[PDB]
Design a protein around this ligand. Structure first.
Ligand SMILES: Nc1ncnc2c1ncn2[C@@H]1O[C@H](COP(=O)(O)OP(=O)(O)OP(=O)(O)O)[C@@H](O)[C@H]1O
Ligand SMILES: [Ca+2]
Lengths: 354, 109
């Protein structure tokens, strides 16, 4: 069958088209010593030097990406690339030189029979059962607002923000450190990330939650580290994700995710705006926070025209909506004519990925 | 003159014909008489909405409740106030921030 590989800055999600979830999720890391990939690189981090091939959504080191792909096929999925068509994903605004190099490697280093490169945000939208709306995709390395009309991502209305999962982890590390604990290394990075996913949430009104959260005997929560050690965690639960709406928290002059959404909508024809406002779809691991849908509703309502219908959609599966949408798409009959093909490849070069 | 209309034979009903032939088709047709890109796109978007209308994926729910429960625990308790207690708390905190700011202004100098 067809393979579906979602190359994220933090996590690769791979599996088989038609399946309801990936079969392999693993860090997008390559380790050489002073070559290992994935979980096996996390373990041996003392000895190994770690690199990340994918930076802010975009592949920037190809050899390590070659080891990531190699790992994916053989170790994770236990297949030959020769025998399976391959769906791959790129970040919106992926430069063309990039999608072409992706295509070449697949055809000449992996000799895949067929291939395709689809836009992550577009796959999430299809996965929500829509072909028009605006997606907010936020992962580990990048956040994008992607306006989409009838299956077409409007390249000039696309908003990018280099503030995502990893920065939030790093910010929590810092504010938990300010409190008295000590989280400064990468072997402490992966610990705090787990706290973030276990206990952080998003405040509806920030000022209000600072002034009022301390009344709940539930605000402060204990968390057992691997030391057997118990630390407490309070208002840093909502101080952490608040950076998405107030990037200044980590010295970023950039505007917050609610404003980029609005800005993005405002770069589209006034006549399709009703459609975008009512189809805000969130995807990516960093949209998991409880309270995030509600806070976006309130924020968008505040920016949008007075009588405008606003509607935030947040599917329980949004950590995976990209991989899912890739598996829906690669299963479709009407889609089968769209695979780029071995034959096609050697009579147009990589340029047939335009 | 009206016979220029006669030269057009509306009675052929070739639009009728092509309409009936299109209705009977399946979302994807076999035999492979290559679709132009636009036909292919329009079919794709039709099939996408179709292969999606009834797909549930509710086996993805409550895969995150520790995070979700802890949040609710808090919002439960925090509703207990009133636009007063909290307006006066926001006003209190506000005044604190000033003192707090005036504080480290003297600190590091
Ligand atoms: N429940 C959760 N709450 C908050 N953050 C979460 C949660 N679950 C996962 N994350 C974060 O989401 C990120 C992973 O999301 P995802 O896999 O969508 O990104 P990616 O595809 O690897 O990176 P990108 O899309 O930015 O290139 C990590 O930062 C992870 O900590
Ligand atoms: Ca991603």
């Amino acid at each position: 069958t067809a393979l579906v590989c979602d190359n994220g800055s933090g996590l690769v999600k791979a599996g088989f088209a038609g399946d309801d979830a990936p079969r392999a999720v693993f860090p997008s890391i390559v380790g050489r010593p002073r070559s290992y990939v994935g979980d096996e690189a996390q373990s041996k981090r003392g000895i190994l030097t770690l690199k990340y091939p994918i930076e802010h959504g975009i592949i920037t080191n190809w050899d390590d990406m070659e080891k990531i792909w190699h790992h994916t096929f053989y170790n994770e999925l236990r297949v030959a690339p020769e025998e399976h068509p391959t769906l791959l994903t790129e970040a919106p605004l992926n430069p063309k030189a990039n999608r072409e190099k992706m295509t070449q490697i697949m055809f000449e280093t992996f000799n895949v029979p067929a291939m395709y490169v689809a836009i992550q945000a577009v796959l999430s939208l299809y996965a929500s059962g829509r072909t028009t709306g605006i997606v907010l995709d936020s992962g580990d390395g990048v956040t994008h607002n992607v306006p989409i009309y009838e299956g077409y991502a409007l390249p000039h209305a696309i908003m990018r923000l280099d503030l995502a999962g990893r920065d939030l982890t790093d910010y929590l590390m810092k504010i938990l450190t300010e409190r008295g604990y000590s989280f400064v290394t990468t072997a402490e990075r992966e610990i705090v990330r787990d706290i973030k996913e276990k206990l952080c949430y998003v405040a509806l009104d920030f000022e209000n939650e600072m002034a009022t959260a301390a009344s709940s005997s539930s605000l402060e929560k204990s968390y057992e580290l691997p030391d057997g050690q118990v630390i407490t965690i309070g208002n840093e639960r909502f101080r952490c994700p608040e950076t998405l709406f107030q990037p200044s928290f980590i010295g970023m002059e950039s505007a917050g995710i609610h404003e980029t959404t609005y800005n993005s909508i405002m770069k589209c024809d006034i006549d399709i705006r009703k459609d975008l406002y009512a189809n805000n779809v969130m995807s990516g691991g960093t949209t998991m926070y409880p309270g995030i849908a509600d806070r976006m509703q309130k924020e968008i309502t505040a920016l949008a025209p007075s009588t405008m219908k606003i509607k935030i959609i947040a599917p329980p599966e949004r950590k995976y909506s990209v991989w899912i949408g890739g598996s829906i798409l690669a299963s479709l009959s009407t889609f089968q004519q769209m695979w780029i093909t071995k034959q096609e490849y050697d009579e147009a070069g990589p340029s047939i990925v335009h | 003159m009206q016979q220029e209309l006669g030269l057009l034979r509306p009675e052929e009903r070739l639009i009728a014909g092509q309409a009936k032939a299109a209705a009977l088709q399946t979302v994807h047709q076999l035999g492979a008489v290559a679709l132009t890109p636009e036909q292919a796109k329009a079919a794709l978007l039709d099939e996408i909405l179709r292969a999606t209308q009834n797909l549930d994926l509710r086996k993805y729910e409550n895969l995150n409740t520790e995070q979700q429960k802890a949040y609710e625990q808090v919002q439960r308790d925090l509703s207990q106030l009133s636009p007063e207690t909290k307006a006066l708390l926001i006003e209190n905190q506000r005044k604190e921030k000033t003192l707090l700011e005036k504080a480290r202004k003297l600190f590091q100098r």
